[PDB]
Design a protein around this ligand. Sequence first.
Ligand SMILES: CC(=O)C1=C(C)N(c2cccc(C(F)(F)F)c2)C(=O)N(CC(=O)O)[C@@H]1c1ccc(C#N)cc1
Ligand SMILES: *[C@@H]1O[C@H](CO[C@@H]2O[C@@H](C)[C@@H](O)[C@@H](O)[C@@H]2O)[C@@H](O)[C@H](O)[C@H]1NC(C)=O
Ligand SMILES: *[C@@H]1O[C@H](CO[C@@H]2O[C@@H](C)[C@@H](O)[C@@H](O)[C@@H]2O)[C@@H](O)[C@H](O)[C@H]1NC(C)=O
Length: 218
Amino acid sequence: IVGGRRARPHAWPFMVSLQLRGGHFCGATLIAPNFVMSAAHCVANVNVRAVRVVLGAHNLSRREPTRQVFAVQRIFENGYDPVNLLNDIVILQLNGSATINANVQVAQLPAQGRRLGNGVQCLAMGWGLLGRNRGIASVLQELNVTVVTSLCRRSNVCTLVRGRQAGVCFGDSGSPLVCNGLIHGIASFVRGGCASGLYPDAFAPVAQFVNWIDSIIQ
Ligand SMILES: CC(=O)C1=C(C)N(c2cccc(C(F)(F)F)c2)C(=O)N(CC(=O)O)[C@@H]1c1ccc(C#N)cc1
Ligand SMILES: *[C@@H]1O[C@H](CO[C@@H]2O[C@@H](C)[C@@H](O)[C@@H](O)[C@@H]2O)[C@@H](O)[C@H](O)[C@H]1NC(C)=O
Ligand SMILES: *[C@@H]1O[C@H](CO[C@@H]2O[C@@H](C)[C@@H](O)[C@@H](O)[C@@H]2O)[C@@H](O)[C@H](O)[C@H]1NC(C)=O
């Protein structure tokens, strides 16, 4: 997250870090005790058997007893189309069930087909890069963003920070966009580099996928 701020610790207990050899590479969202959802581009080409699913995290550079770690049992995809930047969602079934507590909670999803109007206020978040060269992030970041339809296709929810350069960045891939208390987005792609101040950030439109999601998690 570029130009965002540190989250209060465990403010977003559905927020997940996906990791390889102890290094974060992508965000995800706990949507049931034994399922997370993330971006399909996070796991394309990745050794899924080596992926660790980290719940209850805040500061990645610190040892944290609030943490629970799972492996991926199964992957569910929904037509990921990287050429057209479409259907950028996967569900990873875990090898066990999360222990739901103060630091680890299941996110709430919108109704199928819910649309977001121009001007909707959302929070993006993640452990992605902090700038062009500021560094990647230890502490979970969040960011106020506004839903926009200009320079956005119907097949995305897009957001733009007004009046300054800020936005999601590398490593924020697969992280939730929260709007009106619900996970409306999964960070999918940027244009013009991170925080261009021109192109909106694009997210997989979770509302479009809810019937598919419910079929899997129930
Ligand atoms: C392949 C790859 O690694 C990409 C990353 C990481 N991000 C990217 C970069 C910074 C932030 C984010 C975030 F997800 F957070 F929005 C994403 C991009 O933008 N990309 C587009 C490209 O490289 O052409 C890639 C991409 C390609 C296809 C889809 C689809 N559908 C999604 C992303
Ligand atoms: C689920 O997996 C947990 C962590 O497994 C570890 O990470 C994966 C990616 C592999 O590299 C593996 O060798 C590691 O042990 C376990 O700690 C946990 O017990 C598992 N739960 C089960 C089997 O129900
Ligand atoms: C910045 O964001 C704050 C928190 O956002 C609210 O709660 C999150 C979890 C989402 O549900 C989001 O849709 C809500 O807006 C807001 O309280 C605050 O007012 C925002 N400030 C500005 C100026 O945008």
